[PDB]
Amino acid sequence: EAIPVKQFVKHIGELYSNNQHGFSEDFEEVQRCTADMNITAEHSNHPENKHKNRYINILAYDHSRVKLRPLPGKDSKHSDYINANYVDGYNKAKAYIATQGPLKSTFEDFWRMIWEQNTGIIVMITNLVEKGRRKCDQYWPTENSEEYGNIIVTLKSTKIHACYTVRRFSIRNTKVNERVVIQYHYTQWPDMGVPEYALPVLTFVRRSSAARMPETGPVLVHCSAGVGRTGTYIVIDSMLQQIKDKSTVNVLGFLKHIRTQRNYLVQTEEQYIFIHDALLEAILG
Template identity: 45%
Template sequence: MAKVLKENTSYCQLKNSTSVVWENVWKMYQKNRYKTILPYDQSRVILMADAEHTDYINANYVKDNDGKIAYIATQGPKGRTINDFWLMVWQENVTQIVMLTNLIEGGKVKCKQYWPEYTDGEFYGNISIRKYEETQYAFYIIRKFSMSHNEGSRDVTQYHFTKWPDHGTPDPLSLVLFHSHVLRTRPGEKQAPTVVHCSAGIGRTGTYIAFDALCKEGKSKGTIDVASYVKVMRTCRMNMVQTYEQYKTIYLALNEEFKAPVHTKSISAFRERMKHSFREDSSDHVIFEKEFKCLSDIKPVCTNSDFRDVALHTVNTEEEEVMQLDKHNLYLTPTVYNRGYYINTIYVSSFLEENAFIVTKYPSEDGAVDFLRMLIDYESDTVICMDPLAEIESSTSWLPEPFLIKLVGPYSLQHEGGSEIDVKVTSVKILDGRESTHSIKIVQPTGPLKSIENTACLRSLVSYAIHISTENPVTIVSKDGASLCGVFCAILNCIQQINMDDSVYVFTTVRQLQTRRPEFCSTLEEYMLVYKSVKDFIEFTSEHVYSNH
């Protein structure tokens, strides 16, 4: 608490610069998104004027801690300023654009789409922009553009962070991972400033720039001064870092960055590192032990205040082996008489999609009706079990037998057939008594999943999840809602990263999952199982895919 109070005090003591805005800015009111957010004269970006243009754009150069112009902070383009925006990008030799707002938030336009939707390309003034690649991740989108002008052409990459909540702050670790992607794809010869914008170009923009600049300073000098750098930014552009919560986010993100930096490995580097790591000699396990200890040291520390909802809405809270954090709760709709809205269930993101998984435990006989209600409420049509259901006694309370109908509260469950190749799949239809149906597939492993020596069953289960065609969340179930669930999600996320980026970071993947449920991958054996499964996946994949990496 003392640290937070200190941060609050330092933020309250920060003052805005007395720098002067451009004297003719009032003539450009149609080019300003907000009438009170204006560029300072001494640091404003001056466009190359011609007969059709003024030299005005609502943008300022921002220096890093070494006094170098490293950023351009600007507002989100308006319809009438898109041409100016691209002219600035061309003029300043920009190769990276960081976008921190969505086009529409809370029903309000925050930024005009300033890039072409399709690959044909469009002209913005005298500059042709063609989008040739777009890659979507769970928390951000990467778009690559080719810019053409009569002076030549070059590529520009836009990094669009999509999960900064309106009137809120992002998850610090998600911001760190986004920033890591920006850094590792930055051109090696980069000298030009990075364009950073949100809507007004001051709040989120200032937060991100401060984080980036202070990361660089901390790594090179070993010390940082957040308040001092915010003052530097505010001499360049007004009101940079608008709120205390944004100021606090800088501290939280820096803390996440410095306590365990993100290290992404190429596939070839990963294979080399794993070459001798699973021999019987326990000395080969040292790397896993060191990483697992680090994970344990930085794992989120939860208090009773993080589990208030559990205490309020469960009768037998003491019997819950794994409790859900309030901020990640899923709630049920009141469609079943005399049943509450609480269920011990959380959302978990995949590498490519936010809230791709629903993670929970096998329901008891009494909880079966809530489990089915959850599947219907959240339109989950796939349930992946971490055990063969023959080993789970309570499964008879919700899994129908062939040719029979099982009644669970107001629901009727019908067995619709199944198959068994690498995994066992059972199709079930749920009828709710109101002529509406919900079809699900229940997927089970054909053998145990905990074997490090033979990961085939576990990899088959993950492979099934990767290749199913559903836009709905996939429900992952185990005996306590944590053991093996975290392993499964970590392996799937790592494989998605390999397929998408030809790289992997097992440590960071598990670390991110533990922010949702600290009990995920809570033993060294489970952590090693993630590594071994990823290693086996790479080795069993066609060698030529990775031969050039």
């Protein structure tokens, strides 16, 4: 259960103490927290869906997976699949869709999901290629328009900040009519480990979070696998909201809960520590 901000701040000092022993214990607990739950991901594992997964070991649990409307005709059965899950936010079920960086073979699925779920904000926390590893394919028009199945995406504006870029698109469903989608793209996450300074990430979280408008669909959050940095964002954003609303915090409880909705959310102990670093800076700022 939640603890007051004052207690949380001291708890961080305790977690760091003794060569970070407490952070290691908490993280192991997270890693083991769904071990006995027998959570299935049959759809992710289906041979027909194999090419739709960026990473063989990164699944979308069946009970929380985002489903695409099936397409009529041949191979309709597995046309409902995307590697993506609903994930809760602070006091809001299904506040996010956590998903992998789309593949060229999944661009149509990705934009169809955006249309069908009424998503208005995309949070992207990766570069396309990082230290020679392809992490995500470019699913948006560099300029003008690109067509992804029945969704035509038009670039309207690009605003460049030191640590992130904001791209506004107009999208049109050729079978419907037009909607605004804003992509908050974080461009300075290091190729290895976590950012040295939490401040630019906090700023990115605050601004991208503030852009969520009432009565819209879940905010789409993705990185490469859609678990490590994606989980990190989700925990930070949710805990900031909790602190604002209640002056309490529940990082470990909240993270254990969302592990039930998508595998490996907050993938590394370094990310788990970074969450605390970021929340401490927010509290002190």
